[PDB]
């Protein structure tokens, strides 16, 4: 059976992310959302918060599971029984970054990457910008899953 | 079972194209290469030549078949039993063009598109440029499948 | 009083276009939609059809009028009592094209151009793609104003 | 009356910036340059220096005033009596960044953003690069207003 | 001795082009401007006009000569005693196009291409846009060499 | 005699870098690789390691020498007897960054920059990504010169 890994920091997961999960889940036998926390401790939500938000936001996808990633995505793919990497693209910047990483990943491990285009309505949505706006008092609730909104409302006070 | 359509004009098919076919075929149960001939009669090879070149260049992919496309790709996908569209991206220009078409296709029919990154060695390869160079006496044989080279050698004299 | 010209071919006008008109009309005392028909006779709707579709789609904008353009946009701006040009940007390609034309226009006539970002939901909408999809039997009615849909329904049969 | 906010860090203000101010001031009843100092204390000039440099560089624009910004630009716009945001674009990178922020700003507050193209002669001018060159002994005086040059000459020794 | 070919259609040559010639001529022992006329007869100036305009605009560059090109640029380079191709880049679009052609040229013939960045003041200048503006009555004389202006003034009436 | 400076951090030098050196060395009388270490102490290899890796990787280029850079590249060019700067471009991002720096460098010192396109096979290779992959246990030996591989093998344990 085929399997797609969707790696990312998901800090926090957005509706753009969930859209990608849904589209991967419709095409692959199983999907694994791999949460990679960047070495620099400066992130809004801790690993367990990130995991819980993704799980709670994907209860409608029975063939998806959430796991913490360690090391190279390609090692996660090969060791943990997947067949491909799936990532979303919003912009030309995403494309350039992801193209480089995909070619590097194919080179080092023979692992393929498939990209999907953002839904137009979420094209401007990013975890970073949503966090920045939320912290300055802006309403980003329409851009994030309810389980994230619930936690953002508590975290801001 | 899942099924990917890889639409294009393939005039002629290149090693970049075959690379995409191979990568789709490894991920989807079946692949259909859909040849769409553009209304303007100005193309190098006729439909039957295009079909034959793709077939001859993909004998190593048992789960791939070649068909002529008519009308919207999304109608081909829905009527003819596929589940997704697969396209390759070499450049920022490809990305912008393909992003627009993918969003349009999702809007009109709910059909998803997955993109794959060009292999680095074929990033500069296009049917148009290969044809243009070949017609001016340049050697493009390393960029095209042997069945195409064989036919290009005959067509040039 | 300030005045913005929104030049384009509008063949046909889309909801993306109307969105730009609305945003210009909210900022400038008056707006003039200038229809420029390209020398090559290959366009879907004739000048009068184009004019009527824009008028019918902008009845809610009392400070907007529709006119046919001739020659340089900058001459239309200076002679016909406007103060600026307003154009929409969807993509990096639009940006590069429009940047060049804006700098050229500032150079030759001192006329400024202001750009507005596409609404995310219409980012993939273009007259060309909508026409192409419609002619192949695709449903683009959610992307175009009703006065355009009405005429497209008649033109297709 | 219409009003444009031109937000930025202006550390320091450049001739590219002043060019944008001039073009906004010619189109809007009033302009407010909103200085936003980024949380990280690593900036060349303190808030008061930044304010003074902009004021001194815009004495020829009677309808412009300088203010310090706090929080979301869109809140500054709505509370402080403006109608729009105006920003300059030099490059594709600026376009992608500003497009995202404009769509986010329209989403959260309904506030429009208008972009203007850089003057060709200042396209390569940025506060960061000018500061970096100046600190290594390069002559950037033709890229910055005299009030900035005067202060840069003192700051370097 | 080193030699650079600067291929193009030069219809007509602009000040942007001359800027590139000057910069190549300062770096290479000799420069050859190779005029390639595109198969489609739709160009403003005939080959001899193009040749004359370049010659007349480069009298200050003793190490430059003008020639008509036939076939692949790389064949002109190898047969006619040059060592490299030199081309200018204004935009991201130029970069993508020229990158592809350079990689193709290196592949087929081992010939290197060096790119130079446009001067900021000519970044928006192109033969096509200048011709289009001139034909609509716009003043482009500051963008073109005097020998071109002289001929454009005669051609317009 | 002509002379090209190829500035960079080379931390570490990659096969992409060596490719550029080779292509510069074939066109200019001499080449100087100028190693610029960024103020932030966070780099993998110290200056002397960087110098040694470049020297050891370029023994086949008799007209190339390696030096440490201080201050503006343009001062190194003018004082140290070079005539031009040479840099490689892989991506649209490189192009935008390098275009800005080249225009700034021409403005402040009259020094020209020539760009060369990446070899397709190294387009995705960067020092940063190679280091990141290597530190996570990925095999990047095909992307780096043997003298770098030898040192990377020791540094990882
Ligand atoms: N709206 C969206 N549509 C499609 N893909 C997206 C969207 N937002 C993010 N992605 C993709 O999801 C993947 C994981 O994203 P990740 O959480 O690592 O960063 P991110 O959302 O880009 O964060 P930021 O935008 O703040 O840098 C990446 O491929 C990213 O491009
Ligand atoms: N080297 C390559 N790597 C990956 N995808 C590619 C490559 N070359 C073409 N493609 C993709 O293959 C699909 C079909 O291509 P098609 O034959 O329609 O045009 P094309 O190869 O782009 O022709 P041209 O480049 O001459 O316009 C498109 O998605 C295109 O982006
Ligand atoms: N969805 C949109 N959002 C914002 N601006 C748009 C949108 N669609 C078009 N525009 C802009 O409207 C202006 C006039 O467009 P015009 O009718 O000339 O061509 P167009 O819509 O780009 O047609 P095509 O996309 O088929 O080439 C241009 O500035 C264009 O960039
Ligand atoms: N030369 C220029 N022409 C037009 N707009 C500009 C120019 N330089 C900066 N801008 C715009 O001015 C606004 C405020 O700029 P800000 O001071 O925040 O950063 P900046 O000049 O981009 O600094 P840096 O380039 O160092 O990051 C932004 O919209 C920016 O894009
Ligand atoms: N202002 C400029 N600065 C630097 N290089 C330029 C400039 N204008 C054109 N060039 C380059 O000169 C070379 C030859 O140009 P050519 O005459 O073939 O077309 P062009 O000027 O791009 O015409 P158009 O812009 O109308 O398509 C190309 O490399 C082109 O990128
Ligand atoms: N594969 C490549 N092909 C051509 N040029 C390259 C390649 N890799 C790097 N360069 C260029 O070499 C020059 C010096 O590179 P430098 O070591 O400063 O950074 P870098 O390789 O871009 O590092 P990183 O990619 O990690 O930021 C720059 O012009 C860079 O664009």
CSV table of C-alpha atoms in Angstrom, one decimal, chain D residues 7-105:
chain,number,residue,atom,x,y,z
D,7,UNK,CA,4.2,51.7,7.3
D,8,UNK,CA,7.8,50.6,7.5
D,9,UNK,CA,10.9,50.5,9.8
D,10,UNK,CA,12.7,53.3,7.9
D,11,UNK,CA,16.1,52.5,9.5
D,12,UNK,CA,17.1,54.7,7.9
D,13,UNK,CA,14.7,56.2,5.4
D,14,UNK,CA,16.1,56.1,1.8
D,15,UNK,CA,15.4,58.1,-1.4
D,16,UNK,CA,13.3,55.1,-2.5
D,17,UNK,CA,11.1,55.6,0.5
D,18,UNK,CA,10.8,59.4,-0.1
D,19,UNK,CA,9.9,58.7,-3.7
D,20,UNK,CA,7.0,56.5,-2.5
D,21,UNK,CA,5.9,59.2,0.0
D,22,UNK,CA,5.9,61.8,-2.7
D,23,UNK,CA,3.7,59.6,-5.0
D,24,UNK,CA,1.3,58.7,-2.2
D,25,UNK,CA,1.1,62.4,-1.1
D,26,UNK,CA,0.1,63.4,-4.7
D,27,UNK,CA,-2.8,60.9,-4.7
D,28,UNK,CA,-4.2,61.0,-1.1
D,29,UNK,CA,-5.5,63.9,0.9
D,30,UNK,CA,-3.1,63.0,3.7
D,31,UNK,CA,-0.3,60.6,4.3
D,32,UNK,CA,1.0,59.2,7.5
D,33,UNK,CA,4.4,57.6,7.7
D,34,UNK,CA,4.1,55.0,10.4
D,35,UNK,CA,7.4,53.9,11.9
D,36,UNK,CA,7.2,50.3,13.2
D,37,UNK,CA,10.3,49.3,15.3
D,38,UNK,CA,10.8,45.6,15.2
D,39,UNK,CA,11.0,43.9,18.7
D,40,UNK,CA,14.7,42.8,18.2
D,41,UNK,CA,16.8,45.8,19.5
D,42,UNK,CA,19.2,45.3,16.6
D,43,UNK,CA,18.5,48.4,14.5
D,44,UNK,CA,20.9,51.2,13.6
D,45,UNK,CA,18.9,54.3,14.6
D,46,UNK,CA,16.6,54.7,17.6
D,47,UNK,CA,12.9,55.6,17.2
D,48,UNK,CA,13.5,59.3,17.6
D,49,UNK,CA,16.3,59.4,15.1
D,50,UNK,CA,14.1,57.6,12.6
D,51,UNK,CA,11.2,60.0,13.2
D,52,UNK,CA,13.5,63.0,12.7
D,53,UNK,CA,15.1,61.7,9.5
D,54,UNK,CA,11.7,61.2,7.9
D,55,UNK,CA,10.4,64.6,9.0
D,56,UNK,CA,13.5,66.4,7.8
D,57,UNK,CA,13.4,64.5,4.5
D,58,UNK,CA,9.7,65.4,3.8
D,59,UNK,CA,9.4,69.1,4.5
D,60,UNK,CA,8.3,69.5,0.9
D,61,UNK,CA,5.2,67.4,1.5
D,62,UNK,CA,2.8,69.6,3.5
D,63,UNK,CA,0.1,66.9,3.6
D,64,UNK,CA,2.4,64.3,5.2
D,65,UNK,CA,3.0,63.6,8.9
D,66,UNK,CA,5.2,61.1,10.8
D,67,UNK,CA,4.0,58.9,13.6
D,68,UNK,CA,5.2,55.9,15.6
D,69,UNK,CA,3.1,52.8,14.9
D,70,UNK,CA,2.0,50.2,17.5
D,71,UNK,CA,0.4,46.9,16.8
D,72,UNK,CA,-1.4,46.0,13.6
D,73,UNK,CA,-1.2,48.4,10.7
D,74,UNK,CA,-4.9,47.8,10.0
D,75,UNK,CA,-5.7,49.1,13.5
D,76,UNK,CA,-3.7,52.2,12.9
D,77,UNK,CA,-5.6,52.7,9.7
D,78,UNK,CA,-9.0,52.3,11.2
D,79,UNK,CA,-8.5,54.1,14.5
D,80,UNK,CA,-6.4,56.9,13.3
D,81,UNK,CA,-8.5,58.0,10.4
D,82,UNK,CA,-6.9,56.7,7.3
D,83,UNK,CA,-8.5,54.8,4.4
D,84,UNK,CA,-5.7,52.7,2.9
D,85,UNK,CA,-2.2,51.3,3.1
D,86,UNK,CA,0.5,52.3,0.5
D,87,UNK,CA,3.7,50.3,0.0
D,88,UNK,CA,6.4,50.2,-2.6
D,89,UNK,CA,7.5,47.2,-4.6
D,90,UNK,CA,11.0,46.8,-6.0
D,91,UNK,CA,11.3,43.0,-6.6
D,92,UNK,CA,9.5,39.7,-7.0
D,93,UNK,CA,10.4,39.0,-3.4
D,94,UNK,CA,8.7,42.3,-2.2
D,95,UNK,CA,5.7,41.4,-4.3
D,96,UNK,CA,5.3,37.9,-2.7
D,97,UNK,CA,5.8,39.2,0.8
D,98,UNK,CA,3.5,42.3,0.4
D,99,UNK,CA,0.8,40.3,-1.5
D,100,UNK,CA,0.5,37.9,1.5
D,101,UNK,CA,0.3,40.8,4.0
D,102,UNK,CA,-2.2,42.7,1.9
D,103,UNK,CA,-4.5,39.7,1.6
D,104,UNK,CA,-4.1,39.0,5.3
D,105,UNK,CA,-4.9,42.7,6.1
